[PDB]
Amino acid sequence: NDINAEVVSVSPNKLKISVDDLEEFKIAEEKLGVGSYLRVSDNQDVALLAIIDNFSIEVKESQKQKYMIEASPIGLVKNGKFYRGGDSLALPPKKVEPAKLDEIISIYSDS
Amino acid sequence: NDINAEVVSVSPNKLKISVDDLEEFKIAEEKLGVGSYLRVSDNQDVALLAIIDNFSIEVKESQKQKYMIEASPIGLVKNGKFYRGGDSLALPPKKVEPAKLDEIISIYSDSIDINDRFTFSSLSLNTKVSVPVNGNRFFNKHIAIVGSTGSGKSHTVAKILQKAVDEKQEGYKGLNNSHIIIFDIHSEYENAFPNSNVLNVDTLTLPYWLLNGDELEELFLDTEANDHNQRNVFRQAITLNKKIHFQGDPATKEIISFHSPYYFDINEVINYINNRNNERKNKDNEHIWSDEEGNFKFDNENAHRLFKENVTPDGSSAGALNGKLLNFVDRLQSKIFDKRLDFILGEGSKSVTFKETLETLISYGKDKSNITILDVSGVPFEVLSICVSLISRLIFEFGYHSKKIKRKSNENQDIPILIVYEEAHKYAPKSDLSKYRTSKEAIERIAKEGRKYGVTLLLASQRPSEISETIFSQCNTFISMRLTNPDDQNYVKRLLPDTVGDITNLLPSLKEGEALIMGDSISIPSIVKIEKCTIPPSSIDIKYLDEWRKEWVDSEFDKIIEQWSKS
Amino acid sequence: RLDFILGEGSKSVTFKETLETLISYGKDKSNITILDVSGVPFEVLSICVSLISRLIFEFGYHSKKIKRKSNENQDIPILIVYEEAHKYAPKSDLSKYRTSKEAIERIAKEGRKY
Amino acid sequence: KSFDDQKKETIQIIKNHFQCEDYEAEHYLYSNAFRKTYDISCNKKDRRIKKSDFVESINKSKVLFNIWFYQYEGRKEYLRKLKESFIRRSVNTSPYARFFILEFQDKTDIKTVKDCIYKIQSNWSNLSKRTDRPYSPFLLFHGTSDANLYELKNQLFNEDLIFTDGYPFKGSVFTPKMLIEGFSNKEIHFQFINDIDDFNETLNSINIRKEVYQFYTENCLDIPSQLPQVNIQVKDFADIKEIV
Amino acid sequence: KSFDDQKKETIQIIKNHFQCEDYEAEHYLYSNAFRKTYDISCNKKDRRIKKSDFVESINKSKVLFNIWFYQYEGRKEYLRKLKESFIRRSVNTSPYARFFILEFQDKTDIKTVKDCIYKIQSNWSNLSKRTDRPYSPFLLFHGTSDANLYELKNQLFNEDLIFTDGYPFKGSVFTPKMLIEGFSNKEIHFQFINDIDDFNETLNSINIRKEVYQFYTENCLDIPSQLPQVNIQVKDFADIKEIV
């Protein structure tokens, strides 16, 4: 794979994502920025988009890297159509990858 | 089973619930969200019901998933009857299930009588349950509908009013008793209420003589100057002009004052004040004038002669008010000559009647309608505070004088009146500036005292923070569409009683048409989905891109300039 | 320095020619009219801004008086760009800028519908 | 009665006949009715057929492949209408025992069918190391030689897609409890039901909700009717990946 | 044409023909064409050459050294030009199997080779203890005698630059997996591939993305072409310290 991120905690308006494996560094620089968009789903049909709000990458002397991403679920997509919503539930754990080009485009073009 | 949750900790107004199994995932999607309802009991006849304030689903490596639900007990259900109150205590552990449809229905259908229910919305999480409000307590206590632009504030205002108009008592056909006045800054409600009287600047004639002492001085005098001589001559010119135009019983004539609502001609008042600016006296301190009928001396019998412009001063020394009103007269006729004020200060205000003005405002004239829409889009902004204050005071004082007839007849008030204030922060700002002072006190006296006189508010504003806290607190019913400004969010949090966990950050995430109603009208504060307007409040506005896309127009520019010269 | 406002050309110019100049409806039509007010003296700059902003708004005000009489779709929408808008419309209530404050605030409050 | 206007009328008269939902009145009931129209176009001696025979035949549990809307909508549009109509997903798909029956011929190569397996495995499984209820898809392949079926299983194991089939060693009988244990096993990516006889033996040993997503081109099995079935006829195996 | 006009049309014929980018045209294809024209003009035997022959003569996987581009801009400016063209760097360096093939000859001092190794070691390795993905460069030397080659490895060991070479003990066969664990070993600073036969065996044992950087003077080894390649000719070995 390229990135193995995963939702570990769910709040009413807040998502905590743990990045377990980051084999491609270029995903972290561009696609995991402060305001970048993540898709939160276990399938490529229906997804929950979240924008990042904060992150922390901590490394220790013998422990594994602790890359945590803090996000907020701005909306939801079904088959490439984005619906802005509130408190739509994603039951953890959920596979997290950066949102595709057509998904980010559909946030601004659909309205 | 599908759901296995139980209460692990209680507090005075607070339950902590641990979901243990969650076998069926769609229970968590729609029945375990924030604002949903939970049945907390060990049997199936007596239970408490609980709103959901917060939740947290922690998942980790080896231990079980930690789904904790933060709930607050909203009341008590006993054998199909719901009883409000968090006083009843659940001793933990208590089995927790999502509330059934009949339990959520009984929450709102028990605190309100069958004839007191005013339904205009349904619950957002459960469509199949409608959310009625105490329609007496909904309208008698003032309503404040707040939210950002594009949140559906005007559709919600109209849907409340269409349900108020369309509802009727059984056994009669025709119009109902409701009376609603809308101050329309954006001209939206004309399409929403097609069979209603609509008054814009071109047709609505507001008499200037109906302005009281504060409003007449606000329109013409300067508060910052505060000139006692200019104020005194303005009062006595207006008071005398009201007397000489009075056609009635002499006993009524003697009690006519500056504040009494009688017709005076503003052109004659300007002439009198301009005359007393040209005052000249002889060597006996009496101002002597000469006109067509002959020489006369300024006194109470001859002061009406100064309303005519064609008089000349005849005195050796300068008069008492000579050379003191030149700035006042120039300000006085600057307002009159402006064509934008022709609806309030023009020739149409001469022929209008005090009774006809009242019939126009609440639509009691030839054409009667429950909804009166005041399209004040064309009103210039410096007199928007004047015109709103005039109509609000003309309605409050009519509401007050309705009650004083009815107490002599030992009856209650026959008609109640609702006034809707779109863009309510412009009339009543938090700022203590004098330019919006008169519109504040008109809405102040309705907010503080109009409850007893059948005059109430519907404060519909985009920026609730700019509204004065004194008028916003007198409102008791609060509908929040969507607030995204953090200053707006924090002000409303400080203005919303109790209700922790529901108003916190649900308001930014509310969808369009989705609202939070609270107050004494509704049983509990709940997130509702306001039902769709089949006849929406559409405002006809200029689509710049569609007009800019087309051809550069050439025939139009010549027509604009020539009519500007004509007008 | 004030020849543009108080010269011999200001007396001879007509009212229609002024609105062809400020809007570019004259001999050479243009989508954008740039009023280079850098050479305008600073003491009269608010006077020139308020005069033009009043004239442009009143053109749009009388635009609607045509439009109900003729009942025609054709419309002239105008956007005004105020570079350095803080000095034409200051928070201070000084008399040096209340002319340009009032003209801009009329456009900000009423100019949406005109 | 235009092309679109007549299409709206036949949907409403179908919905009046069955009193059913609209998602399968257009995508499942209308498509099967059109197929029987062209099926009787070869021999057209019958114009008056009783409603107990023609309507009964088109009201199967199977969604037949229509070539005309395959050409009129297109390849991408037709498969998109099979997404939103039958294979409906949520954000929070539950751990159900999902069964995927796929039809195998010898003309289909292994590489295309592998790409359907990784499509099914990545979309219908949550083998997360943090989850408490992991689920894995059940795969059944049929209509093929055993040499081609065993060949597909061998290359699936070599690229680290660990599966189980109820045969943990040579000479083992079909023990079905490896499939249910492999369903909740985080290290088993999917289940591999070998043939028809192991499918019915597996169904009696699972108590949670079972869904069957059959995808066929020529032949379809008579699976029992109490569990939910979702059957799509496709033109080729390459269309199954864009459907699931 | 003036000197400020004909140079920026000299690349446009190659650039539009090969549809290449900026860096591999002005520094990789122009510079080879300049050198390939002098050695055919200074020769007094043949001048005629086909344009298709000239296409394949300069489009080799090699950055040819150019003498005239050494005094025109200087020693510092030429190595700066070669630095940012093919050895572009990022903030985060990926844990890749980078192979460095440096030409060691007998005229080169051992010391000048040594500071090239520390320059490669300090640039292309992250042997921090907090790394969960440590990496370290592979070093290959060719063209030198084994006595001079073994002398270089002995001095590297005395000053605590610990390396592995695939021979963990005396008399061992070449085990390529000692280079593999040394790549992820924090205590091993680099890998020291001995000869070209050891180099091809190590490539088959690497599954992650690998890159090759060759720096030579006269003779250049042939790497298989599917790998990323950087083959840069220099005047002497001391230039390699200032480009990597």
Ligand SMILES: Nc1ncnc2c1ncn2[C@@H]1O[C@H](COP(=O)(O)OP(=O)(O)O)[C@@H](O)[C@H]1O
């Ligand atoms: N109850 C509702 N249900 C669905 N959509 C609504 C509802 N109310 C308003 N809307 C939509 O929201 C949009 C915003 O309208 P409105 O809220 O009236 O604007 P504003 O809040 O600025 O007055 C409208 O175009 C309307 O289509």
Ligand SMILES: [Mg+2]
């Ligand atoms: Mg509105």
